[PDB]
Every structure is written in structure tokens, then in C-alpha cells.
Amino acid sequence: MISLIAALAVDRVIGMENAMPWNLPASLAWFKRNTLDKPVIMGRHTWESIGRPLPGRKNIILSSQPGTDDRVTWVKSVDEAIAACGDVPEIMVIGGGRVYEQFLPKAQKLYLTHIDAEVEGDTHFPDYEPDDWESVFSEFHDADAQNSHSYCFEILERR
Amino acid sequence: MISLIAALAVDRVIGMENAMPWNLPASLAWFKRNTLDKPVIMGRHTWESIGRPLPGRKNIILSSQPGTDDRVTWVKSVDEAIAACGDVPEIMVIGGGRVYEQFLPKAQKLYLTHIDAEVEGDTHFPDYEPDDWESVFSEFHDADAQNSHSYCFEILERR
Ligand SMILES: CN(Cc1cnc2nc(N)nc(N)c2n1)c1ccc(C(=O)N[C@@H](CCC(=O)O)C(=O)O)cc1
Ligand SMILES: CN(Cc1cnc2nc(N)nc(N)c2n1)c1ccc(C(=O)N[C@@H](CCC(=O)O)C(=O)O)cc1
Ligand SMILES: [Ca+2]
Ligand SMILES: [Cl-]
Ligand SMILES: [Cl-]
């Protein structure tokens, strides 16, 4: 089963290249809890923003360009990315935009962090008609001394 | 001598009700570099925001209220704060607003990170007179894959 995990600002704006203007360690903990011990597929820009292999996960980079680093798996197509995962219960696709667009059709679950931040951006998370998806869990949190903005975790299942 | 080290958004904003809406590991690395192996003096709110004692530094908390952690030194006056420092070449004051206000008058140097972020602030860095300070180092950087906003590091020495 393929799942997409994303952090979205108002209007579904997502990061493109530069780091997003927010500080949400609680959201990063949610991210870690949901991807640990699973294969993660990301595009090149996401890899650069991360800056190192995520520990405890099989890191797969989908890109047309060459594999800089030997610590991760470089793939050139969706098929190859899938194959590289082997046979596991759940594959996590962590972005960016183009990567999400390529896997959404095959996706069965969405883990989303909705953040109350108005960011100007070009890229948006693909349009999902939540009537093709059942929202199964939603939990809101206010901003605090450690988290810059209000955020809401949501899990949606493909119906 | 005493030095103040701070991260200022536009209009000299240093703090908000919640965590600052930025992600700047480069600025945190500059903060680490310049405070390592030195005593650091902070107010209670800054302490609570950090969450733990800063490694490799002597952590001194200036507050009217009682000590909640055995890992740090709790002081009740600027005078006591200074004394707790011992015989060191440089004492770093890391905030917040009220602490900076109390130490500015005794400071000989400022290490500033100016960040291009427009935010409604709660607390601001005390107004400094540009005629009283000399900039001896400046370095600009744009936002990138890991840093959400452009910033510039500056070190000023009292004329
Ligand atoms: C830029 N980036 C991509 C990123 C960030 N937040 C997301 N958040 C959500 N919800 N979804 C994503 N796909 C997502 N992707 C990053 C950057 C750093 C780490 C990271 O350091 N993660 C550590 C946890 C934090 C830490 O140890 O500092 C981990 O083990 O996952 C993760 C993703
Ligand atoms: C909230 N806060 C106060 C803070 C933040 N940035 C600043 N930046 C500058 N330039 N000046 C300050 N006084 C300053 N103070 C913090 C929070 C965390 C860490 C921190 O984790 N510092 C690690 C470095 C970062 C890391 O390991 O992620 C250190 O060793 O100094 C420091 C200050
Ligand atoms: Ca100069
Ligand atoms: Cl990407
Ligand atoms: Cl404080």
C-alpha cells in the first residue's frame, strides 16, 4: 500500500526548494513516528532540504539526475522506485510536488499536517476530492512556545 | 567583557507569543559557535523555551523566582549573574528583552543575526545608537534548502 505524507499551508501550498517559514517540531515528530521502519520515496529538492539519509528508513530518491551519494538508492522512474521498496506493508511518499502528482493515483492513504500559515508559493499539493477519500482521523493543536503555528493532523483513506 | 547575542527580525523583533516562524539552522550554528565554552546568561522565559541546558556552556538563569532545575545556576541579580561567571574573558547574554535591556549598558560587543522576516512582535531588542557602535564583520546569505529566510550576521564593537 502506498501512502503520501505532506505538510500543507493554507491553500495547499507546499515547499518547492527553500525551507518553509515555520518551526513545528511536533509535526516533525509525527512525521518521524509515521515513517520510521518504512521505505520513503522523495524527489531531489526534498533530499537537499533533508540533507542526510533519514535514519531507520530505506531512502529512495526519484530523479533524472545522478546519484551523488552511496548511502541512498537513486531511481529514475516510478516503477523502479516501487520495485526498490521490496514487499512491505506500506511505502511512504514524502514529496515534493511532482513526486506527489506521480503517486497520488496509486495512493490508498494520506497523512496530512494542515498548518495555519499563509505562504506565497508556486507549488500546491495535488487536488484531492475528499469524496474519494474518507477523513478518518483529525486532531487540532494550537501554536505554543515550541510550535510557530496552529496545526491539524489528518488521515484520509481512499474510498 | 560582556557581549549580547540576538536574532532580530525587521523592526528589531526578537520574540512573539509563540515560537518564531522561521527555520534557520545556519543561524543556530552561528549562535553555537559564538557561545560554546562560555558562560551564557538568560532570562526565565528564554530558559523555558530552550527546554534543556545548552551543552558545553555554563548556563546561568536570571530570575526573581525559584530554581526549578539542578542542572543550571539560578541568580537573582545582574550582580550575582556576573559573579557566577568567574574569571572569563567574555560573558554572553542570550536574551530575552528585559535581560538585554539590563545588560546593554555594560556591553562592549553585539553579535547580531538580522533576519528578513516581517512579524508582529511581542518583545523587541533595545534601541541601539548606530553612532556608538562600529560594525567589524558582516555576511549576507539568502534563504536556501534548509533556511527559510535571508539573514545577515554582524558583529559590532562599542566605539
Ligand atoms: C525538509 N524535510 C521534509 C519534510 C518535512 N516535514 C514534513 N512533514 C510532513 N508532515 N510531511 C512531509 N512529507 C514532510 N517532509 C524534512 C527535514 C528534516 C527531517 C528530519 O530531521 N526528521 C527527523 C526528525 C527530526 C530531528 O531529529 O531533528 C526524522 O527522524 O524524521 C524530516 C523531513
Ligand atoms: C529559543 N532559543 C533562543 C535563541 C535562539 N536563537 C538565537 N540566535 C541568536 N543569534 N541569538 C540568540 N540569543 C538566540 N537565542 C534557542 C533554542 C534552541 C537552541 C539550540 O538548540 N542551540 C544548540 C544548537 C542547535 C541544534 O543542535 O539544533 C546549541 O548548541 O546552541 C538555542 C537557542
Ligand atoms: Ca566596518
Ligand atoms: Cl522534491
Ligand atoms: Cl527571558
Curated annotation (Swiss-Prot), chains A, B:
Highest taxon listed in the record's lineage: Bacteria
Impact noted for substituting residue 92 to F: No effect. Increases catalytic rate about 7-fold
Q: Which GO terms describe its biological process?
A: 10-formyltetrahydrofolate biosynthetic process; dihydrofolate metabolic process; folic acid biosynthetic process; folic acid metabolic process; one-carbon metabolic process; response to antibiotic; response to methotrexate; response to xenobiotic stimulus
Please name the InterPro entries in this protein's record.
DHFR, DHFR-like_dom_sf, DHFR_CS, DHFR_dom
User: Any one cellular component term from GO for this entry?
Assistant: cytosol
Q: Which residues bind NADP(+)?
A: 7, 13-19, 45-46, 63-64, 76, 95-102
DHFR domain mapped to chain residues: 1-158
Effect ascribed to mutating residue 42 to Y: Increases catalytic rate almost 2-fold. Increases catalytic rate about 7-fold
What happens on changing residue 154 to Q?
Answer: In strain: 1810
| Reaction(s) the record says it catalyses | (6S)-5,6,7,8-tetrahydrofolate + NADP(+) = 7,8-dihydrofolate + NADPH + H(+)
Q: Pfam families, alphabetically?
A: DHFR_1
Pathway assigned in UniProt: Cofactor biosynthesis; tetrahydrofolate biosynthesis; 5,6,7,8-tetrahydrofolate from 7,8-dihydrofolate: step 1/1
Molecular-function GO terms, alphabetical: dihydrofolate reductase activity; dihydrofolic acid binding; folic acid binding; methotrexate binding; NADP binding; NADP+ binding; NADPH binding
Family in the record: Belongs to the dihydrofolate reductase family.
| Function of the protein | Key enzyme in folate metabolism. Catalyzes an essential reaction for de novo glycine and purine synthesis, and for DNA precursor synthesis.
Q: Give the free-text miscellaneous remark of the entry.
A: The strain K12 sequence is shown.
The name on file for this protein is Dihydrofolate reductase
